[PDB]
Design an enzyme around this catalytic site. Structure first.
Site, PDB file in Angstrom:
ATOM      1  CG  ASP A 180      -2.107   0.880   1.133  1.00  0.00           C
ATOM      2  OD1 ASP A 180      -2.092   1.845   0.338  1.00  0.00           O
ATOM      3  OD2 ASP A 180      -3.113   0.598   1.824  1.00  0.00           O
ATOM      4  CB  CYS A 214      -5.409  -0.300  -5.254  1.00  0.00           C
ATOM      5  SG  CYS A 214      -5.740   1.391  -5.770  1.00  0.00           S
ATOM      6  CB  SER A 215      -7.114  -0.053  -0.520  1.00  0.00           C
ATOM      7  OG  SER A 215      -7.988   0.011   0.597  1.00  0.00           O
ATOM      8  CB  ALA A 216      -8.291   4.494  -2.387  1.00  0.00           C
ATOM      9  N   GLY A 217      -8.452   2.769  -5.209  1.00  0.00           N
ATOM     10  CA  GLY A 217      -8.627   2.857  -6.646  1.00  0.00           C
ATOM     11  C   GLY A 217      -7.980   4.101  -7.227  1.00  0.00           C
ATOM     12  CB  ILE A 218      -6.610   7.009  -6.385  1.00  0.00           C
ATOM     13  CG1 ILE A 218      -6.044   7.032  -4.976  1.00  0.00           C
ATOM     14  CG2 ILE A 218      -8.122   7.072  -6.285  1.00  0.00           C
ATOM     15  CD1 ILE A 218      -6.409   8.291  -4.226  1.00  0.00           C
ATOM     16  N   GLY A 219      -4.101   5.070  -6.011  1.00  0.00           N
ATOM     17  CA  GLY A 219      -2.655   4.972  -5.895  1.00  0.00           C
ATOM     18  C   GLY A 219      -2.018   3.971  -6.838  1.00  0.00           C
ATOM     19  NE  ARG A 220      -1.942  -0.589  -3.539  1.00  0.00           N
ATOM     20  CZ  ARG A 220      -2.277  -1.352  -2.504  1.00  0.00           C
ATOM     21  NH1 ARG A 220      -1.533  -2.414  -2.204  1.00  0.00           N
ATOM     22  NH2 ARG A 220      -3.347  -1.054  -1.771  1.00  0.00           N
ATOM     23  CB  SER A 221      -5.905   1.949  -9.492  1.00  0.00           C
ATOM     24  OG  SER A 221      -6.399   1.010  -8.554  1.00  0.00           O
ATOM     25  CD  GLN A 261      -3.018   9.242  -3.083  1.00  0.00           C
ATOM     26  OE1 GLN A 261      -3.021   9.481  -1.874  1.00  0.00           O
ATOM     27  NE2 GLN A 261      -3.426  10.129  -3.988  1.00  0.00           N
TER      28      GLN A 261
HETATM   29  C1  LIG Z   1      -1.559  12.494  -2.833  1.00  0.00           C
HETATM   30  O1  LIG Z   1      -2.863  13.132  -2.967  1.00  0.00           O
HETATM   31  C2  LIG Z   1      -3.335  13.425  -4.201  1.00  0.00           C
HETATM   32  O2  LIG Z   1      -2.712  13.173  -5.212  1.00  0.00           O
HETATM   33  C3  LIG Z   1      -4.679  14.091  -4.269  1.00  0.00           C
HETATM   34  C4  LIG Z   1      -4.784  15.301  -5.045  1.00  0.00           C
HETATM   35  O3  LIG Z   1      -3.720  15.872  -5.719  1.00  0.00           O
HETATM   36  C5  LIG Z   1      -6.016  15.995  -5.163  1.00  0.00           C
HETATM   37  C6  LIG Z   1      -7.170  15.514  -4.521  1.00  0.00           C
HETATM   38  C7  LIG Z   1      -7.101  14.323  -3.750  1.00  0.00           C
HETATM   39  C8  LIG Z   1      -5.866  13.570  -3.592  1.00  0.00           C
HETATM   40  O4  LIG Z   1      -5.793  12.352  -2.803  1.00  0.00           O
HETATM   41  C9  LIG Z   1      -7.000  11.891  -2.155  1.00  0.00           C
HETATM   42  C10 LIG Z   1      -6.867  10.622  -1.345  1.00  0.00           C
HETATM   43  C11 LIG Z   1      -6.149  10.306  -0.232  1.00  0.00           C
HETATM   44  C12 LIG Z   1      -6.290   8.913   0.256  1.00  0.00           C
HETATM   45  C13 LIG Z   1      -6.948   8.614   1.496  1.00  0.00           C
HETATM   46  C14 LIG Z   1      -7.068   7.266   1.923  1.00  0.00           C
HETATM   47  C15 LIG Z   1      -6.538   6.208   1.125  1.00  0.00           C
HETATM   48  C16 LIG Z   1      -5.874   6.486  -0.114  1.00  0.00           C
HETATM   49  C17 LIG Z   1      -5.290   5.436  -1.024  1.00  0.00           C
HETATM   50  O5  LIG Z   1      -4.813   5.856  -2.256  1.00  0.00           O
HETATM   51  N1  LIG Z   1      -4.339   4.719  -2.922  1.00  0.00           N
HETATM   52  C18 LIG Z   1      -4.513   3.635  -2.133  1.00  0.00           C
HETATM   53  C19 LIG Z   1      -4.117   2.207  -2.536  1.00  0.00           C
HETATM   54  O6  LIG Z   1      -5.003   1.225  -2.213  1.00  0.00           O
HETATM   55  O7  LIG Z   1      -3.083   1.992  -3.125  1.00  0.00           O
HETATM   56  C20 LIG Z   1      -5.138   4.086  -0.865  1.00  0.00           C
HETATM   57  C21 LIG Z   1      -5.468   3.100   0.245  1.00  0.00           C
HETATM   58  O8  LIG Z   1      -4.828   3.428   1.468  1.00  0.00           O
HETATM   59  C22 LIG Z   1      -5.763   7.848  -0.528  1.00  0.00           C
END
Ligand SMILES: COC(=O)c1c(O)cccc1OC/C=C/c1cccc(-c2onc(C(=O)O)c2CO)c1
Length: 298
Positions: A180, A214-221, A261
């Site tokens: 993660d 992934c867990s949130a669908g933004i980092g690893r995805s 992320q």
């Molecule tokens: C770094 O932040 C940003 O890039 C950003 C931005 O520029 C503008 C608006 C919102 C933003 O992030 C919102 C989310 C935070 C946030 C909060 C909780 C969990 C996760 C998360 O992200 N990926 C995973 C994973 O499963 O790999 C997880 C699972 O733990 C992200």
């Protein structure tokens, strides 16, 4: 020349800055539907929501919400649906989306339990004799077989629309060694995984958008989708020079917030793409080398 920029950024340790520039410039759109009180229990993370303009709507009349976005890459000609790891109450919604969107594959880049915390519901069956029935969306899911490798598992599932008794084969690609907020062990193992998804046809246009999560669908995805799109663009014209990864990531962030992320995931995306270029440019023997370097054999 993306490799030049890599040496440049690396040479002057400016990944944190580069990455922050992307955040400062990322798109920002309303997520009103996601924030409605009724959809509170349909969101895993308070700070992670789908924009209204690109969210996937469930074809039900009751509540059509589900934390998922259609990332539609126009120039690249590829679409992906990014979504959070299903919650105990949204697994039905999850497979309804898969069925309605006509997806053939599902790419899970996280594990159910990470750092001693439940990051995702167990939304698919683990044993063939114990199939799962989703009463709310009236769908049935059966594990048909699974090919377990060292760091990833490929499952074959059968999804049945209990209302029409129509069935579809769903391929489930599960990367089990991506921390993660971390990065793959190497770009070798990553690409190996990506190409495995490609081999399956799951990404073809004849099928609905592949569902990535992934867990949130933004980092690893994000990391996964970015490397794929960049490698595809590079492929369309066989011109590594015309691929602006940072610009591509920004194009993706118009469809879903916070893709990629950490600055290290960004750095990895570059690595993956750069290495992947080797195959795209005519060296087909590199794909085997990745398979070897990955050590998928148990
Ligand atoms: C770094 O932040 C940003 O890039 C950003 C931005 O520029 C503008 C608006 C919102 C933003 O992030 C919102 C989310 C935070 C946030 C909060 C909780 C969990 C996760 C998360 O992200 N990926 C995973 C994973 O499963 O790999 C997880 C699972 O733990 C992200």
């Amino acid at each position: 020349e993306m490799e030049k920029e890599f040496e440049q950024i690396d040479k002057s340790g400016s990944w944190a800055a580069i990455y922050q520039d992307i955040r400062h410039e990322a798109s920002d759109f309303p997520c009103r539907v996601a924030k409605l009180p009724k959809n509170k229990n349909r969101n895993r993370y308070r700070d992670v929501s789908p924009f209204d303009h690109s969210r996937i709507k469930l074809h039900q009349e009751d509540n059509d919400y589900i934390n998922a976005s259609l990332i539609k890459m126009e120039e690249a000609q590829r679409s992906y649906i990014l979504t959070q790891g299903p919650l105990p109450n949204t697994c039905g919604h999850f497979w309804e989306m898969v069925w309605e969107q006509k997806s053939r594959g599902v790419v899970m880049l996280n594990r159910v339990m990470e750092k001693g915390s439940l990051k995702c519901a167990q939304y698919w069956p683990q044993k063939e004799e114990k199939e799962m029935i989703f009463e709310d969306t009236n769908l049935k899911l059966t594990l048909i077989s699974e090919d377990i490798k060292s760091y990833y598992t490929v499952r074959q599932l059968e999804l049945e629309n209990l209302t029409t008794q129509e069935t579809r084969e769903i391929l489930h690609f599960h990367y089990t060694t991506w921390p993660d907020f971390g990065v793959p062990e190497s770009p070798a193992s990553f690409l190996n995984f990506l190409f495995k998804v490609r081999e399956s046809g799951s990404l073809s246009p004849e099928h609905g958008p592949v569902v990535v999560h992934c867990s949130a669908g933004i980092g690893r995805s994000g990391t996964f989708c970015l490397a794929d799109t960049c490698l595809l663009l590079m492929d369309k014209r066989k011109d590594p020079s015309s691929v602006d990864i940072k610009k591509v990531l920004l194009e993706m962030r118009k469809f879903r917030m916070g893709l990629i992320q950490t600055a290290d995931q960004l750095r990895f995306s570059y690595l993956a793409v750069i290495e992947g270029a080797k195959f795209i440019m005519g060296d087909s023997s590199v794909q085997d080398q990745w398979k070897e370097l990955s050590h998928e054999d148990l």
